[PDB]
Amino acid sequence: SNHYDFQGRSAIITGGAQGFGYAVAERLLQGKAKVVLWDMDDKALAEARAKLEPLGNVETVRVDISDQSDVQQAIEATEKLTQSIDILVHSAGIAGQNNPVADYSPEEWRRVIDIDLNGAFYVNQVVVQRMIAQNYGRIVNIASIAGKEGNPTASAYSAAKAGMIALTKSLGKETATRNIAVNAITPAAARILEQCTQAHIDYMLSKIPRARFVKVEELAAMVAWLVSEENSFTTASVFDLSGGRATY
């Protein structure tokens, strides 16, 4: 196992209460990072803070990342809980409903975009302003293989993840002269799988050369390197986590 030091550093993890956010948070606590979880459910936030308390200093901010004003409120709250805002891991989002484009609910289309794309923009804006002032930042936008491939029956999710990737490239190039790294990850499928049919799981596994889903701890390991001081040159870049699926 490797050790990633985050002593003196403070992290925001959106979608921090569960899944990737939660796995990343546990790993950042293991390296002495000060962690602030951002999530929309106060109850899930309580469960998370209780579990990670033996691991270190964890705080909770309740926020809808699809609401720009709630995001402004979330950032001001974080400033009162932290010495600085060194790291952002934007993990929050929704999968969206599956439907061909011909039958997609425009209402569901707007919602998936608003949360998966506009929210990442709102969260990246308030956080990077603090990184600009500090001349220090390490951001990871958790996107998906859907962002690179345009996954069939998931046009909305695929489009929002793509936007998040291009946002990552604009932001990275804008902050390249400062000591700030803005990178994105493209994982394959990692509780969400309980909804899938066995036939669907075998279709998804057919597309993955690894022949298995990524473990949340594997995502956390890569993200921890990407949010570390040591990731000092690479910016506006996509890191893959698809177990050989991605061809770029």
Description:
The protein has helices at 19-30, 42-52, 68-81, 106-134, 145-149, 155-174, 192-195, 198-206, 216-226, and strands spanning 10-14, 34-39, 58-62, 87-90, 137-142, 180-187, 237-241. It has 248 residues and is an alpha/beta fold. The protein has one domain: Rossmann fold. The two termini are 28 Å apart. GO terms for molecular function: oxidoreductase activity. Belongs to the short-chain dehydrogenases/reductases (SDR) family. This is SDR family NAD(P)-dependent oxidoreductase.
Strand order of the largest sheet: 3-2-1-4-5-6-7
From the helix content, strand content and strand pairing, which structural class follows? Answer: alpha/beta
Q: Estimate the strand proportion.
A: 15-25%
Give helix % range.
Answer: 40-55%
* Number of DSSP helical runs: 9
Per CATH, the class reads: Alpha Beta
Number of beta strands = 7
Shape: globular
Described by strand count, sense and barrel closure, the largest sheet is: 7 strands, parallel
* Structural domains: how many: 1
CATH superfamily: NAD(P)-binding Rossmann-like Domain
CATH domain fold name? Rossmann fold
Reported CATH architecture: 3-Layer(aba) Sandwich
Task: Determine Rg (CA atoms, Å).
Answer: 17 Å
Order of helices and strands: EHEHEHEHEHHEHHHE
Rounded to the nearest angstrom, the distance between the terminal CA atoms is 28 Å
Family: Belongs to the short-chain dehydrogenases/reductases (SDR) family.
Protein name: SDR family NAD(P)-dependent oxidoreductase
Domain Ketoreductase: 9-190
Organism: Herbaspirillum huttiense
